[PDB]
């Protein structure tokens, strides 16, 4: 209930640049699973949290890179794998599937006593920029999901316990972080104020 003021002298302009307007590396997914479906698969869609969804939808087209950092909390020497799978190749469905043994996709291997892993993914959209809002139809026949671009796909990561079935049981918690770099945006758009109702489209 106290109303005060302060005179403010400023000269900074480069604080509001778009490159460090989006370099904050917020969290994008938090899910735990067990092992005694014994893994974790997650599409790399971006509109999962409303703190990041509204902040991203100010623009029309943009172009950046991933900088994915997986943080793991959960024991004798747990080794984990995060096999990236892009489009064109198939996704694993069981823990000992032969898609794990495939070399044609990228993979990491890391412990728990180590600091958590870090990779980055370049711009893999087949257009020149990501399409945030898609004003058309993916397909020719009438029932097409209005607002899904086939160029909007990125891939999906899969997290798996490497070790043998041990006589102890445990539960692994996985968090993902994503830091955009080298930002170039176009055509600014007004924000959405009415609350979201789904993740597939804009309804209210």
């Amino acid at each position: 209930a106290i109303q005060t003021r302060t005179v403010i002298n400023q000269h900074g302009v480069s604080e509001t640049l778009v490159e460090n307007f989006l370099s904050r590396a917020a969290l994008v997914s938090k899910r735990s699973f067990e092992y005694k479906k014994n893994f974790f698969k997650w599409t790399i869609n971006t509109r999962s949290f409303v703190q990041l969804r509204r902040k991203l939808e100010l623009f029309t087209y943009l172009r950046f890179d991933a900088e994915i950092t997986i943080l793991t909390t959960v024991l004798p020497d747990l080794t984990l794998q995060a096999m990236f799978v892009p489009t064109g190749a198939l996704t694993p469905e069981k823990q000992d599937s032969f898609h794990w043994q495939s070399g044609s996709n990228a993979s990491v291997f890391f412990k728990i006593s180590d600091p958590p892993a870090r990779i980055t993914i370049p711009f893999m959209c087949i257009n020149s920029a990501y399409s945030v809002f898609y004003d058309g139809f993916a397909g020719f026949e009438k029932n097409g999901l209005y607002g899904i671009n086939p160029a909007d796909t990125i891939g999906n990561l899969c997290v798996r316990i490497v070790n043998e079935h041990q006589p102890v049981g445990f539960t692994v918690t996985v968090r993902v972080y994503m830091k955009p770099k080298h930002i170039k945006a176009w055509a600014p758009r007004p924000p959405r104020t009415l609350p979201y109702m789904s993740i597939a489209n804009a309804n209210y």
Binding site: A1, I2, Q3, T4, R5, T6, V7, I8, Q10, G12, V13, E15, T16, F21, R24, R31, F40, K41, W42, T43, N45, V50, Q51, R54, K55, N156, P190, P191, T193, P195, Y196, M197, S198, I199, A200
Partner: protein, 148 residues
């Protein structure tokens, strides 16, 4: 009012604009009076003229330009608890009726006003935070797609 919610401290000058949309035969004078951030809002027409006031009619120009000299602001978390200290009251932009409306016997006897706003090139921002504009969460229909 939707970009500055992300930040904490703002400072700069503004620019308000009005656009009257009456008929071509319609006339009438209005008055716009500014208020310094010290005192209170004016009440009558006479007490409002003693501030920075302008006289704007209809027949010559349907547009007008007003310059706000300076604003400021912060949020001031100063207590021990989770409290919200409201910022102080700054300025008033009022509008009184100088003359009553003159219309011919053909047109409707009702007019309209629309107010614009635009910031100048001294407007600066600092200390980006999150915005409470949406809310925490609502019920999502298809909450999980990737996981399954």
């Amino acid at each position: 009012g939707n970009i500055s919610r992300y930040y904490t401290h703002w400072s700069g000058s503004l620019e308000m604009t009005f656009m009257f949309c009456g008929s071509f035969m319609a006339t009438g004078k209005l008055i716009l009076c500014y208020t310094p951030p010290g005192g209170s809002c004016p009440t009558t027409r006479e007490t409002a003229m003693l501030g920075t006031h302008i006289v704007w009619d209809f027949g010559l120009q349907s547009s007008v330009t007003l310059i706000i000299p300076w604003i400021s602001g912060s949020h001031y978390r100063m207590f021990n608890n989770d409290a919200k200290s409201t910022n102080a009251n700054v300025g008033y932009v009022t509008c009184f009726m100088q003359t009553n409306l003159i219309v011919p016997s053909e047109s409707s006897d009702t007019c309209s006003l629309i107010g614009f706003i635009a910031a100048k090139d001294d407007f600066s921002l600092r200390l980006m935070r999150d915005s409470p504009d949406i809310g925490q969460l609502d019920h999502l229909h298809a909450a999980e797609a990737a996981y399954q």
